[PDB]
Amino acid sequence: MELSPDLISACLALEKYLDNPNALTERELKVAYTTVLQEWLRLACRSDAHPELVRRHLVTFRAMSARLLDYVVNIADSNGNTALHYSVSHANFPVVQQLLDSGVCKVDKQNRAGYSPIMLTALATLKTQDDIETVLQLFRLGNINAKASQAGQTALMLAVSHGRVDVVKALLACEADVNVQDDDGSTALMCACEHGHKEIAGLLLAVPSCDISLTDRDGSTALMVALDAGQSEIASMLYSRMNIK
Template sequence: MLEFVLNMFPSPGLCNVDKQNKAGYTAIMLTALAATRSDDDMATIRQLLQLGDVNAKASQAGQTALMLAVSHGRQDMVRALLAGAADVNLQDADGSTALMCACEHGHAEIARLLLATPACHVGLDGSTALSIALEAGQNDIAVMLYAHMNFAKPPSPVSDGWA
């Protein structure tokens, strides 16, 4: 599949890489689902990410390339998309973020990658990644999220004991 997607766009400027197909997906979204076989594949993917909108949303469900890569467990693509400035906090039509997708599908290592992004929010609009992890029975991810929410925050100013 990767070869098919990459061959669709042989040279910069010849095609609109942000054009959606009939299903509502762009070349970047389709690439996010593909398996890479070599460093050359990743180099081509990084080039594609620079040419298009990594934060475009699919027309039907509003998913981004990052959400698709997360949902399908494509850790290499998640890394590439994050390096290509993918927004971890965008929400799809249901209000889910990439982190929520990782929680729902049990992708702990991908959740860890997303949490390492400084801008990553654990909860948006009343639904939290923690509640999704718990509902999905992903206890290891729930523990990771709880620790992130409670222990990864900068320390509060230390009181000198004088009130």
């Protein structure tokens, strides 16, 4: 439960650059950025990462400079991942929470593959009410309706595709747009239909604004996707929402 002298030392170097871009040589800036990145991720993104030690470092960065705090919290690795990407991916929600409480996280930042930390919540199982409350906090800070640069998928589509009922519920509780279509015209509902996520399909259908008449690029509605997949229980749920002329 000690602050990292190597991290603090490189932070001091970086702070000079943040104040004046010609304060460091090219060599010095490279070593400073690299050293901040490694020591910060050591601290925040190992599997034994301690939230109180993260907080203590954030409080110190803030005192040094508001710009340093912002810079370190959001520092990205070679894959475009930040500490918040990794903490969400590992479901270390107590660390996520300290990150969010910094007041400076860029929660919509997409990594190389196009995923923001909000999208990466589809990789996380929410086990406690504290986990759920942290995730809700994340979804209140950023754009839950953003489309990943890859195939235009949203967090909701990704949560449906991973069968994550808990994350789906959290997204809907924050009015996630259920009618967003990906690059192939597919909606979250069509994903639930294709893969037989029956609980999740029910959750989506209960959303008043869910538009079951949308078609993908092949002209298929959710119902057609369900009938074609032999997802008969889901097909019946759809028929109950329709008004057949």
